[PDB]
Design a protein around this ligand. Structure first.
Ligand code: DGT
Ligand code: MN
Ligand code: MN
Ligand code: MN
Ligand code: ZN
Ligand code: ZN
Length: 993
DNA sequence: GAGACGGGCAACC
DNA sequence: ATAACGGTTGCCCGTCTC
């Protein structure tokens, strides 16, 4: 039985063990089956191939899973396609993991009181879930979580606590400074827990230095409910006569090995530990043997080594070799301390450890319920706001339809405590408008007609209908035969003669709030990127400075970065590693916290009768103390269920159509949604006056948000939507993995159902399951499950089958990885159509707005040279296929729209010293003049300076332009070489004040 | 050696 | 071409310029 680190050359026969961390199966022309595994015994790893000799072995091959352990007897060959050595197996036996066993008697088990999770930035490697699971297996009565400076593992510890029935002790390793050493804080109760949240807040905010820190006095202030340990070798007392110690409720001692970096020798460490023992008995302070766990098993160490090493001589913990700090069993802990005698062994390893755990109650770090804000007048105001607005559109009294929609909608919104955020949402939209920035609708609030009446969405969820903007008469359609009111043919009020307005997308209110109101949705708004910060700030004014917080995020090491760290470490250590082994080192690194950041837009609202510390600590994103916003210490996901969120988002659609409006004088709300020429671009280039050959594309949607992508263009080619609601079906099908490809697309092509019958929004799942007989709340639950890509449980399938829901439909639900709500699809489609109207009728406005707002990657020389030149760049990038760099892809998107622009008869002029603007593409006859910031290296600040300076006074020489415009040599050259500066002298022979 | 700038990446909707 | 979910904010860090 060979360890995998000894497999080094081709070799006739080896027997090998290892965890299978990857397994796939494929079929050969011959009919034979091939199993391909990666396995590691944790000294190294290797790829393994096995060739089936019969269908019995072929199916056993399918039984091999990630997580199994396997003994393989095989040959070792160079595989020249995988470019590494590889085992060709003829023998595979599954085997026990036979892992470290905790052999002490039941009730005589150890409790770990000092332990680090992947949340100890770049320092610890095994997830808290795995650790807690291991403690459970070992029979530990409890386990502690004590991360450095943070409590970000709490949410996951809790979950695992409940799933596994393990008692968790919620703690902190804190940096205390006297008014810079380590202590262990263990929370005994909610008081303690809130004090923890507080201390981590103060340490990240008022007292952050290079590292979150806590003055001792502030610790004392917030000590109630905490047990304080003297902790580490970087502890106060280990770092040495006696008063210091009386400060701790417990005294820590690590296994002698853990201290090995140094002191004279192991015998002295051993002495120091014995004096801490002397001290503890002397002062009646329990002494505890703690592990300082930074990973599960002895071998997991290498992952910690790789992370730490990535930091460089900057961390200098790389100065010394790293201690064995794995999760030690209760029998092995005794072994480590056998030198103190068997009575003291048992005392500090189990009796005292157990005793400290006994002093800890059962704390719930994350709350169960939702706490909802109160602002006097709100329930009342949302009611009147919406009845008033509804009456002026639909008449007095209201049609039964509308009236019933409002009654049912309000009692839910009001009763489940959402009236406040509707209102705050309405003011945000109102102020943005008044400030000159229109707002784009998004997400599930468009399922709510009250939301429509409060002008928080442009989406009207009522069934399709005509309404007169004058006489107010209404015509609704519930035949279901008509998809969206926007599909209706233009018509006149048969009563006043006035031309009818059309609306209604037939969306059920429940998509938003469900039936129980056990769901907590949010309100999503698309503000323009330029405006987003201001909308954010307005919520401070509305709720008060201390009752809102930006949701914070935790940046972890994901695959690409992990791979990056491992390769470098290999390189620096001169290791030649196999793909398989690099893979497995990579995997052991992912999950580890590297930084913190900011939710892209969500603001979390704290009810005035609670406080943020009932829910999470707070801090600064990335620890920037000059940040305008404080962030939540837990991310939004951990507290999803406790506080409402306003998704105040940034998006280009509002900005673009704002510019389209400010350039044309046209009110986008007046734009028709059934303009044949506009809608034609979704299935043809005709409306654009160009050939498919001319623009290398069969449909007219280049540049159109969502629809301009290569994937979506292809979908359009095959579906040819013309109707608003057909576009809405496509919007749904084109967003989310396994929605179209391998799912709907096949169902349509098999003829197993029609385009319109295929599942195109989460709503249709609910509406159809109710139709088919199921209980609405259950139909809701099922919709919610598939649209989160969670598939179907057995109970769901059973309820579906029991109601004649066809197998192809059930099977289609199980595929969907993600899925729009109809209201979002309608909102986006409406936005895309408004823009399309400019693409078609005001092309230059469309392009000026596109390159101004959306593009950030150019090849200006190509663009200026024109059609043939652009085409050549594009073909260059096409040749690279899916081997194109993210940036080439970004550029390809923009060149595609340049080539189309040029073919439609327009063009690009060179940067122009006196006509170019800073950041905006301007219209000049049939051209666009590029702005300065389009030049590579020339970013916004310089662009703005060049314009400022020129407005202060024109440029008298290249030199003058360089000084006043703040231009580097390279940038100056850029302009020179292109003839931009030709009309200027290099320098002036005079200069005056 | 501090400050633009852009790429590369992670979180998120 | 293949297969293909689209689009947004924000942080780090190497690079290139004084
Ligand atoms: N293309 C795409 N769009 C998304 C994705 N996630 C969210 N969005 C868009 C569509 C959603 O309706 C909206 C995201 O809103 P939320 O995350 O608040 O969820 P949504 O509002 O759909 O449901 P909710 O009722 O809030 O639980 O933005 C995604 O993975 N892909
Ligand atoms: Mn420590
Ligand atoms: Mn520690
Ligand atoms: Mn939402
Ligand atoms: Zn540590
Ligand atoms: Zn009328």
């Amino acid at each position: 039985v060979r360890r995998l680190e000894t497999i080094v050359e081709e070799e006739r026969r080896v027997v090998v063990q290892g965890y299978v961390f990857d397994a796939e199966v494929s079929e050969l022309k011959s009919g034979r089956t091939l199993l391909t595994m990666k396995i590691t015994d944790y000294t190294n790893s290797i790829l393994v191939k096995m060739f089936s000799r019969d269908k019995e072995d072929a199916e056993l091959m399918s039984g091999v899973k990630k997580g199994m352990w396997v003994k393989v007897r095989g040959s070792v060959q160079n595989d020249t396609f995988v470019r590494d050595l590889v085992i060709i197996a003829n023998d595979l036996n599954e085997i026990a993991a036979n892992e470290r066993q905790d052999t002490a008697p039941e009730g005589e088990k150890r409790v770990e009181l000092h332990l680090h999770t992947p949340m100890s930035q770049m320092d610890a490697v095994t997830s808290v879930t795995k650790l807690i699971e291991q403690a459970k297996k070992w029979g530990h009565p409890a386990i502690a979580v004590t991360d450095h400076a943070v409590v970000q593992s709490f949410p996951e510890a809790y979950s695992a606590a409940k799933k596994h029935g393990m008692k968790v002790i919620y703690g902190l390793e804190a940096n205390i400074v006297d008014d810079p050493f380590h202590v262990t804080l263990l929370a005994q109760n909610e008081t303690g827990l809130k004090n923890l949240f507080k201390l981590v807040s103060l340490s990240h905010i008022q007292y952050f230095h290079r590292v979150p820190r806590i003055p001792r006095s502030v610790l004392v202030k917030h000590r109630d409910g905490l047990l304080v340990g003297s902790g580490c070798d970087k502890g106060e007392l280990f770092d040495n006569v006696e008063d210091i110690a009386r400060f701790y409720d417990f005294l820590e001692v690590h296994p002698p090995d853990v201290y090995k970096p140094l002191v004279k020798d192991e015998e002295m460490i051993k002495n120091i530990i014995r004096s801490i023992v002397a001290l503890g008995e002397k002062l009646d302070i329990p002494v505890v043997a703690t592990g300082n766990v930074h990973y599960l098993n002895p071998e997991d160490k290498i992952y910690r080594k790789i992370l730490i090493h990535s930091q460089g001589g900057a961390n200098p913990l790389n100065r010394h070799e790293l201690p064995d700090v794995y999760f030690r069993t209760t029998n092995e802990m005794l072994d480590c301390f056998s030198f103190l005698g068997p009575e003291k062994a048992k005392e500090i390893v189990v009796d005292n450890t157990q005793k400290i755990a006994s002093l800890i109650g059962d704390v719930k770090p994350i709350k169960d319920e939702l706490y909802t804000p109160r602002i006097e007048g709100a329930d009342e105001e949302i009611r009147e706001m919406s009845y008033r607005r509804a009456k002026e559109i639909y008449g007095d009294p209201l049609p039964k339809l509308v009236e019933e929609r409002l009654e049912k909608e309000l009692k839910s919104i009001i009763g489940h405590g959402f009236a406040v955020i509707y209102l705050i949402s309405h003011k945000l939209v109102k102020k943005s408008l008044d400030d000159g920035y229109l707002v784009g609708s998004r997400g599930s609030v468009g399922s709510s007609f009250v939301a429509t009446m409060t002008e928080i969405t442009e989406v009207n969820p009522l069934p399709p209908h005509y309404v007169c903007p004058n006489c107010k008469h209404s015509e609704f359609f519930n035949d279901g035969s008509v998809g969206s009111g926007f599909d209706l043919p233009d018509k006149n009020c048969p009563r006043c003669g006035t031309k009818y307005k059309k609306d209604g997308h037939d969306i059920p209110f429940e998509t938003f709030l469900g039936f129980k109101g056990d769901k907590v949705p949010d309100i999503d708004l698309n503000f323009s990127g330029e405006y987003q910060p201001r909308a954010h700030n307005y919520t401070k004014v509305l709720f008060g400075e201390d009752n809102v917080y930006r949701a914070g995020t935790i940046g972890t090491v994901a695959d690409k970065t992990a791979y990056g760290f491992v390769k470098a470490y290999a390189s620096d250590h001169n290791l030649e590693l196999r793909g398989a082994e690099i893979d497995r080192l990579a995997a052991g690194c992912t999950g580890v916290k590297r930084t913190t950041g900011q939710h892209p837009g969500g603001i979390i609202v704290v009810p005035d009768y609670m406080e943020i510390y009932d829910f999470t600590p707070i801090q600064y994103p990335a620890d920037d103390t000059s940040s305008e916003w404080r962030t939540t210490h837990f991310d939004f996901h951990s507290i999803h269920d406790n506080l409402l969120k306003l998704d105040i988002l940034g998006h280009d659609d509002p900005t673009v159509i704002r510019m389209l409006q400010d350039l044309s004088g046209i009110d986008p709300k007046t734009i028709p949604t059934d303009d044949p020429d506009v809608m034609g671009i979704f299935s043809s280039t005709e409306p654009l006056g160009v050939t498919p050959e001319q623009i290398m594309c069969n449909v007219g949607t280049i540049g159109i948000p969502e629809f301009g992508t290569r994937f979506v263009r292809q979908m359009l080619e095959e579906t040819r939507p013309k109707t608003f609601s057909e576009l809405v079906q496509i919007s749904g099908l084109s967003h989310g993995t396994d929605v179209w490809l391998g799912n709907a697309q096949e169902l349509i092509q098999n003829g197993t159902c029609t385009l319109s019958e295929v599942i195109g929004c989460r709503d249709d799942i609910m509406v159809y399951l109710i139709y088919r007989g199921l209980e609405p709340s259950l139909a809701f639950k099922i919709m919610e499950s598939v649209r989160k890509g969670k598939g179907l449980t057995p109970e769901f399938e059973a309820e579906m089958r029991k109601h004649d829901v066809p197998e192809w439909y059930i099977d289609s639900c199980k595929k969907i990885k993600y899925m729009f709500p109809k209201a979002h699809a309608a909102a986006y489609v409406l936005m895309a159509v408004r823009i399309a109207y400019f693409k078609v009728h005001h092309p230059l406005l469309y392009y000026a707005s596109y390159f101004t707002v959306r593009a950030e990657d150019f090849d200006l020389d190509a663009m200026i040279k024109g059609s043939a030149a652009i085409r050549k760049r594009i073909e260059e990038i096409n040749a690279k296929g899916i081997q194109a760099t993210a940036k080439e892809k970004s550029l390809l998107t923009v060149l595609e729209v340049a080539l189309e622009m040029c073919e439609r008869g327009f063009s690009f002029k060179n940067i122009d010293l006196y006509r170019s603007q800073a950041t905006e593409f301007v219209i000049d006859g049939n051209s666009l003049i590029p702005p300065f910031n389009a030049i590579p290296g020339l970013g916004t600040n310089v662009a703005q300076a060049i314009v400022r300076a020129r407005e202060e006074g024109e440029f008298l020489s290249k030199e003058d332009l360089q000084q006043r415009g703040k231009l580097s040599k390279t940038l100056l050259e850029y302009l020179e070489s292109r003839g931009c500066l030709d009309s200027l002298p290099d320098h002036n022979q005079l200069s005056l004040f």
